[PDB]
DNA sequence: ATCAATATCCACCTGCAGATACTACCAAAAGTGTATTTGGAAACTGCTCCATCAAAAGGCATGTTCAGCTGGATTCCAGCTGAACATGCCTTTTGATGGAGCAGTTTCCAAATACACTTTTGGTAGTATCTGCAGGTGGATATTGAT
DNA sequence: ATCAATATCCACCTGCAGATACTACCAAAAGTGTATTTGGAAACTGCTCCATCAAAAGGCATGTTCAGCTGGAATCCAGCTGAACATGCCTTTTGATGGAGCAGTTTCCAAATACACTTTTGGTAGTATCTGCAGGTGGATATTGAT
């Protein structure tokens, strides 16, 4: 599993919060590919910040900074 | 006859239910697995603060939810009510994620 | 310390802190005296604006404590705050209830 | 007692003061205060970077209230800017005419 | 008898001609007056360096060209070849320019 | 001896042929009759926004003349970085 | 002896060092910072000029113009991404007609 | 000299040198050189800004070649990053090997 | 229209996570006082380039007619996706234990800054001469569309 | 597949705008050489919180069934929109002008940095008490969907 651990029902819940009524069977795999690309992009950058700071632990701040520079500023984790 | 709701009746009910709540919609552990797996390709032997993983889930889900909104707009533009891969593909191209 | 610069300026937000943060920030070689005052005032005001609308949202929802959901409803229902925060994600905020008309029954 | 004390400052206590002036009987959760803290930090950075560029563009070594003011005009949507400018000018007046 | 190209043939010839060249497509003077008129509504008695007007034109034309591409993609999604206001509106909505 | 006639309705100097041409560079083959007016409205907004910021730079610097650099800075801050005009 | 020849560089190490102090990026700038950054800038310049000169050659020209810069950048996936939010003045677009628009 | 105009420096002579290395018989128009000059300035500012932010995030008051290096890795795509990294490391090693 | 099966709502209740309130403690942060340095406003003005006018001419816009073919409407149905139900597999939780490693602290030197000269150089300026290619011509080949 | 109207290609040519070549000058830039200062790497480690178990408990995911209703194919036609033509206007181009306003330079002081010395305060930590509201209950009533 892993990526396949992100389930049809979970993807459907997400779709529903985004206002989606009806879903093509091919959507679940499209969606997983997209989520993978999103995480690759954000994680690459976060890990690059971890490495700079000489740490073995990815912190919330590593993630937060990575998100900000991807134009995806997240509030709530700057402690 | 036993009782059945028409197709689309329950879908609408979940839209109303999920747009009212804020809880995360992907299971916590499988997401954690996926995250660690991707990170392992960039650097081995990594640990994560637990708030690091949650920042990543908050951001990922907010991204997919807003993407689903744009996708839905592209379906409707084509006079459908069913989202397809081509609707996702159009939304991402226009966002500049594929362009 | 006689009078704090915040009390002098009429403010709850810390003028002295804003000043030190401007300098440590590598924004310019120098920083005038009114700049941290002006900026602290600006920051205080925008905070008041958000807490005001978010508080109202707590009221509407039958609550006296502001949670992130309320900060989200406040920001997304205000045209201008939504624009300022247009590339920002409020964690545990969810979304505004919104269904496209063509998806409604009949 | 000064060791693991490494100061973690935030705007949380100043946010809370302002809360009471606008909603004296409303409280705020930790998570929501954290959101508000991010908000003040983010808007501080935006305004300050804009002022920075302004002064660099105009070959000046000093950020003044004038740079803060133009930054705000460039950054905040119409009406939000008008009131922020109004609040900013007021605090610099009050501050000058003070002891 | 007289020669007629079928509808769409000259359209396609014009696409190739314009995708091959880099010259600006809006007439200069009229663009210049539009700029002066919009600016004057913001502030009286402004003058313009002529390269400031050209910078606005180059930017405005690359913005409009790239928007037509997205618009076109939106028409085609709907199984049309004709761009309509609703394609522009869809493109701008997904771009984050609208909503 | 001093001029400046009233500037009005200059949006209409963005002609149907000029708009067709831009649509062609953008790969468009066929164009609805309502596209012209929609495009004028979208240019107006784009220009308003860039000019507003360009003029804010001008005023801050205490000049009466909008420079290429004012425009370049306005474009950058809006995420439409322009190369070729300085800076 | 220049810091540039000492680094094996065509780009100006001293100018870069000075621009770094001037731009208020940190309180201190280390001696290796401008060396590494001139190197990177020269390399990216080389990369674009390589590709743009080829575009000039393909179009039977010996002088690089902005058209050639745009063709070089837009035809290269990495430069295209690096400059994804940048307009090259006088550059136009890549010839590209959507399939469904062609006749048959 | 007319009340000597203050000097306007550019990367032109350096872009020109690099050009003769790669395409010895190719010229560049002044408009093309102006794009190249904007390109070097732009990428300078982006790498310096990332470096600046990096230093700050880590409470470092010095931008070293290590900050430039990470900023290069954050900013540039795959293969450009790898090659840039290698060129800048080479130049630093060389530069410190003298004396 | 009836009426049943569900969902959904409001009123109330109560445990508890998480908020609140009090007290102690202390570095670092903020104010205040004194001595010095300087950024950049004022004043004056040299010199660029912006606004404006002139006049000539032809590229290109406007407005029209005509009909090809597109979009938009209608109808149809095959099949994909929603609903519902039956399992059972794995996420959750939680309580608890090593132990990685982030984070505080003290050291200390390689490298940064300050500074004082001295040399080198890129930018500007003036004046003068090549050269790549736009855009014009004229004629040959290719594309399109009517039969 | 043939024929003709027309676009398109390419070779060729020649003006000339812009690119290039020298000389000359210098203010700022850059290098060199010391003296003086310190940022942060190094090494040691204490305690926070991260990974890993254990272990029910059951929630929620997966597989299957069945059919409603959606998507997409096929068909038609009105009329929008492209192509072409005639006409002539207003953009473009070339050239000249005063003069606004930008930008160089020098003067000079209100306000900044730079240090020191004293006082304050926000953040951390410990202990203790308080409370908004999630979540569970019951019972009313609204919704949905079959007749
Ligand atoms: Cl699809
Ligand atoms: Cl000030
Ligand atoms: Cl429309
Ligand atoms: Cl260094
Ligand atoms: Mn007006
Ligand atoms: Mn001075
Ligand atoms: Mn006419
Ligand atoms: Mn007809
Ligand atoms: Mn059709
Ligand atoms: Mn059927
Ligand atoms: Mn250890
Ligand atoms: Mn020289
Ligand atoms: Mn030619
Ligand atoms: Mn130290
Ligand atoms: Mn249908
Ligand atoms: Mn004057
Ligand atoms: Mn206190
Ligand atoms: Mn409840
Ligand atoms: Rb604004
Ligand atoms: Rb990168
Ligand atoms: Rb109800
Ligand atoms: Rb041909
Ligand atoms: Rb830990």
Burial F48-79 (b: 16+ CB within 10 A, else e): eebbbbbbbbbbbbeeeebbbbbbbbbbbbee
Cβ contact, residue pair G86, F85, below 8 Å: no
CA dist., res. F63 & res. D71, Å (int): 17
Give the contacts of B2 (CB within 8 A, at least 6 positions apart). Answer: none
CB B63 within 8 A of CB A74: no
User: Locate tokens 């624009």: which residue?
Assistant: C83
Q: Which contacts of D13-17 are long-range, i.e. CB under 8 A and separated by 24 or more positions?
A: D14/C12, D14/C13, D14/C14, D14/C44, D14/C47, D15/C47, D15/C51, D15/D40, D17/C12
- Expressed in Å, this structure's resolution amounts to 2.3
Phi first, then psi: give them for residue E79, nearest 5 degrees: 65, 30
Q: Please report residues of B whose CB lies closer than 8 A to that of A65.
A: none
CB of E11 within 8 Å of any CB in chain F? yes
Strand I at less than 7 A from CB of H25? no
- Between chain D and chain G, the number of residue pairs with CB atoms below 8 A apart is 3
Strand J at less than 7 A from CB of D37? no
Q: Crossing angle of helices C35-60/C68-76, nearest 10°?
A: 100
For every residue of B17-38, DSSP letters joined together read: HHTT-----S-HHHHHHHHHHH
Count how many domains chain C has.
1
Nucleotide nearest to H7 (CA to C1'): I123
Phi first, then psi: give them for residue E98, nearest 5 degrees: -110, -60
B96 to each of B4, E67, E94, G33, G80, how far by Cα in Å? 43, 12, 10, 33, 12
Going from N- to C-terminal start, the domains of chain F cover 1-87
DSSP type of residue C103: G
Residue among H10, H75, H76, H63 at smallest CA distance from H40: H10
* Local structure of C106: helix, strand or coil: coil
D40–chain C nearest CA distance, Å: 6
Look up residue F42 and give its two tokens. 């979208």
Burial class (CB in 10 A: 0-12, 13-18, 19+), B85: middle
CA dist., res. H99 & res. H96, Å (int): 8
* Chains E and B touch each other (3 or more Cβ pairs < 8 A): yes
Strand I at less than 7 A from CB of E80? yes
Note down the domain range covering H27.
1-99
Domain of residue G10, CATH code: 1.10.20.10
Q: C-alpha G63: how far from its chain's center?
A: 17
Kind plus residue range of the DSSP H or E element containing C8: helix C5-9
Count how many domains chain H has.
1
H58–chain A nearest CA distance, Å: 7
Tell me how far apart the 2 most distant CA atoms of chain H are, in Å. Answer: 50
CA dist., res. D95 & res. C19, Å (int): 14
DSSP type of residue F5: P
Experimental method, per PDB record: X-ray
Q: Is the dihedral of CA G83, G88, G94, G99 positive or negative?
A: positive
Cα Rg of chain A, angstroms: 15
Second CATH level (architecture) for the domain A1-79: Orthogonal Bundle (1.10)
Q: Give the residue from chain B lying closest to C73, CA to CA.
A: B20
Q: Give the residue from chain E lying closest to G91, CA to CA.
A: E22
G50–chain D nearest CA distance, Å: 32
* Chains E and A touch each other (3 or more Cβ pairs < 8 A): no
The dihedral over CA atoms of G61, G65, G71, G72, expressed in degrees to the nearest 10, equals: 90
Note down the domain range covering C30.
1-106
Going from N- to C-terminal start, the domains of chain B cover 1-99
Burial class (CB in 10 A: 0-12, 13-18, 19+), E80: middle
N-to-C CA span, chain F:
38
Give the contacts of B97 (CB within 8 A, at least 6 positions apart). Answer: none
Nucleotide nearest to C16 (CA to C1'): I30
Strand J at less than 7 A from CB of C31? yes
* Local structure of B6: helix, strand or coil: coil
CA of residue E21 to C1' of nucleotide I138, angstroms: 24
Residue among G20, E27, C104 at smallest CA distance from B13: C104
Q: Is the dihedral of CA B19, B20, B24, B27 positive or negative?
A: negative
Cα Rg of chain E, angstroms: 18
* Chains C and F touch each other (3 or more Cβ pairs < 8 A): no
CA dist., res. H16 & res. A73, Å (int): 40
Q: Give the residue from chain H lying closest to G9, CA to CA.
A: H91
Strand J at less than 7 A from CB of B49? yes
CB of H56 within 8 Å of any CB in chain C? yes
What CATH number has the domain spanning E1-99? 1.10.20.10
- Between chain D and chain F, the number of residue pairs with CB atoms below 8 A apart is 19
Which ligand is nearest to the Cα of residue A56, counting in written order? 23
Task: Determine the topology of domain F1-87 in CATH.
Answer: Histone, subunit A (1.10.20)
CB of A18 within 8 Å of any CB in chain C? yes
Cβ contact, residue pair D74, F61, below 8 Å: no
Residue among H43, E44, C68 at smallest CA distance from D37: C68
Look up residue G45 and give its two tokens. 């310049």
Domain of residue H28, CATH code: 1.10.20.10
């Amino acid at each position: 599993d892993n990526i396949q651990g992100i389930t049809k029902p979970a993807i459907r819940r997400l779709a529903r919060r985004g206002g989606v009524k009806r879903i093509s069977g091919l959507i679940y795999e499209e969606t997983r590919g997209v989520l993978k690309v999103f995480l690759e992009n954000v994680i690459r950058d976060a890990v690059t910040y971890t490495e700079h700071a000489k740490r073995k632990t990815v912190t919330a701040m590593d993630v937060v900074y990575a998100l900000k520079r991807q134009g995806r500023t997240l509030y709530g984790f700057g402690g | 006859k036993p009782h059945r709701y028409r197709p689309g009746t329950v879908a609408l009910r979940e839209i109303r239910r999920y747009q009212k709540s804020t809880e995360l919609l992907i299971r916590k552990l499988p997401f954690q697995r996926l995250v660690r797996e991707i990170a392992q390709d960039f650097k081995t032997d990594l640990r994560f603060q637990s708030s690091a993983v949650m920042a990543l889930q908050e951001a990922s889900e907010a991204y997919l939810v807003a993407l689903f909104e744009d996708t839905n707009l592209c379906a409707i533009h084509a006079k459908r009510v069913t989202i397809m891969p081509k609707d996702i593909q159009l939304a991402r191209r226009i966002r500049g994620e594929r362009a | 310390k006689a009078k704090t610069r915040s009390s002098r300026a009429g403010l709850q937000f810390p003028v002295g802190r804003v000043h030190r943060l401007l300098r440590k920030g590598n924004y310019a070689e120098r920083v005038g005296a009114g700049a941290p005052v002006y900026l602290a005032a600006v920051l205080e005001y925008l905070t008041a604006e958000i807490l005001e609308l978010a508080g109202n949202a707590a009221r509407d929802n039958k609550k006296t404590r502001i949670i992130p959901r309320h900060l989200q409803l406040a920001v997304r229902n205000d045209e201008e705050l939504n624009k300022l925060l247009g590339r920002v994600t409020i964690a545990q905020g969810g979304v505004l209830p919104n269904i496209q008309s063509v998806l409604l029954p009949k | 007692k000064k060791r693991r004390k490494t100061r973690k400052e935030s705007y949380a206590i100043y946010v809370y003061k302002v809360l009471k002036q606008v909603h004296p009987d409303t409280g705020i959760s930790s998570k929501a205060m954290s959101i508000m803290n991010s908000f003040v930090n983010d808007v501080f950075e935006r305004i300050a970077g804009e002022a920075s560029r302004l002064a660099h563009y105009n070959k000046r070594s000093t950020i003044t209230s004038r740079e803060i003011q133009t930054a705000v005009r460039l950054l905040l949507p119409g009406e939000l800017a008008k009131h922020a400018v109004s609040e900013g000018t007021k605090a610099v007046t009050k501050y000058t005419s003070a002891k």
